[PDB]
Amino acid sequence: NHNLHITEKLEVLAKAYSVQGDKWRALGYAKAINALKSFHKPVTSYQEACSIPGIGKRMAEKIIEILESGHLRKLDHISESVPVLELFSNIWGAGTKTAQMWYQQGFRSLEDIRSQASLTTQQAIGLKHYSDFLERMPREEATEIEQTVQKAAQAFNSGLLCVACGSYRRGKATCGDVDVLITHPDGRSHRGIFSRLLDSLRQEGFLTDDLVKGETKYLGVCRLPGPGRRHRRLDIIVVPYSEFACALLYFTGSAHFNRSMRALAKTKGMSLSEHALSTAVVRNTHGAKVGPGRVLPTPTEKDVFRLLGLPYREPAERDW
DNA sequence: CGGCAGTACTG
DNA sequence: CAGTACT
DNA sequence: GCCG
Ligand SMILES: [Mn+2]
Ligand SMILES: [Mn+2]
Ligand SMILES: [Mn+2]
Ligand SMILES: [Mn+2]
Ligand code: NA
Ligand code: NA
Ligand code: NA
């Protein structure tokens, strides 16, 4: 990154807008930040700034103040609530609205939350693991978690295929959580396995808490056995084989990569989701779907890229 | 002016 | 439904 | 916040 002295300041404002609920302004900041973090050269001119897709006059103005003064005055006017809103929003299951409500009601510390807040079932689990869920794991540990799920799955049906996606599959050295996709080539045997699979992982002691238990996705908490182990977030999704390519593409991400591809598909009268790539999709003037279109066959990730007119990208170059 | 991805849970 | 979460 |  050639523009650390710029992006460090702007990320502070991005986080401030985000925890305060100003989601679209925060998205603009996030995009400008990766745009600036990807430019080879330090930015030198106002005219240099606007050159960058994702930087307009407002952002260019800010960048100029930074290079001429070394600072951004807006930083000095960020609300005192923001560190607390960030503290509270880092509880799994609490977002901006819950954080703002707790702040309004006078809460200022996790001790206040523990002793006085009404927590949802998910939020009480998030609070209990507050520190663990903010720590990343070595990818070696993500492998052990993937293999634990796979052995429990393959015990029920040898044909089940399990793949760790997310940051693991993009090849990162550390992972925030483990994202496991499960399917079955026979197009049938994936059905109703959650019952037995989660029960199997629970009877081990491996699964320690459940956050979401849906028909197709599970979000929870695990911990490998032995000393020196932290609780880790684990997500599992079970999909039919006909959706494997799109599910793999979705679950591998990154998030910004997925949003970029989905926006591209929209421009082409298409729609991309974790289930399918569709064409001839009918939308209103508001960008909203009002007609479903036709599902396109996508046996592999490469086919999704091809049907969108894009060169194929390995998971590691999807780390946007 | 107005979209900014598309979807699944939860209560 | 609003809220939060997933990539 | 940016951009079509
Ligand atoms: Mn992940
Ligand atoms: Mn995850
Ligand atoms: Mn722990
Ligand atoms: Mn994530
Ligand atoms: Na620009
Ligand atoms: Na949260
Ligand atoms: Na009180």
Q: Break chain A into its structural domains and give their ranges.
A: 4-76, 81-134, 137-244, 245-317
Q: Does domain A81-134 have CATH number 1.10.10.10?
A: no
Task: Work out the angle at residue A314's Cα, subtended by the Cα atoms of residues A312 and A319, and round it to the nearest 5 degrees.
Answer: 115
Which residues 228-267 of A interface with strand C at a CB distance below 7 A?
A: 233, 235, 250-255, 258-259
Q: In whole angstroms, what is the distance from residue A143 CA to residue A138 CA?
A: 9
Q: In whole angstroms, what is the distance from residue A18 CA to residue A171 CA?
A: 28
Q: In whole angstroms, what is the distance from residue A70 CA to residue A64 CA?
A: 9
Q: Which nucleotides in chain C have some atom under 7 angstroms from a protein Cβ?
A: 2-7
Q: Which helix (H) or strand (E) holds A8?
A: helix A4-19
Classify residue A304 by burial, with Cβ atoms within 10 Å: 0-12, 13-18, 19+: buried
By C-alpha distance, which of A165, A163, A129 is closest to A149? A163
A108 appears as a binding residue in the annotation? no
Could you give the residue numbers annotated as active site of A?
Answer: 62
Q: In whole angstroms, what is the distance from residue A302 CA to residue A170 CA?
A: 16
Q: Which fold has domain A245-317?
A: Beta Polymerase; domain 3 (3.30.210)
Half-sphere exposure of A319 (CA within 13 A, CB side): 14
User: Could you tell me the distance in Å between the CA of residue A254 and the C1' of nucleotide D1?
Assistant: 22
CATH dotted code for A4-76 = 1.10.150.110
Q: Are strands A178-183 and A161-164 parallel, antiparallel or unpaired?
A: antiparallel
Whether nucleic acid strand C comes within 7 Å of the CB of A96, the answer is yes
Q: Which ligand is nearest to the CA of A109?
A: 7
Q: Does domain A137-244 have CATH number 3.90.1150.10?
A: no
Q: Which nucleotides in chain D have some atom under 7 angstroms from a protein Cβ?
A: 1-4
Measured in angstroms, how far is the CA atom of residue A19 from the centroid of ligand 6? 10
CA-atom Rg of chain A in angstroms: 22
Task: Indicate if A245-317 has the same CATH topology as A81-134.
Answer: no
Range list of β-strands (E), A134-206: 137-138, 161-164, 174-175, 178-183
Whether nucleic acid strand C comes within 7 Å of the CB of A123, the answer is no
Amino acid of residue A274: E
- Whether A170 contacts A316, CB under 8 Å: yes
How far does chain A reach from its first CA to its final CA, in angstroms?
14
With b meaning 16 or more CB within 10 Å and e meaning fewer, what string describes A269-280? ebbbebbbbbee
Query: What resolution in angstroms, rounded to 1 decimal?
Result: 1.9
Ion ligand 5 nearby residues (CB, 5 A): A 50, 52-53, 55
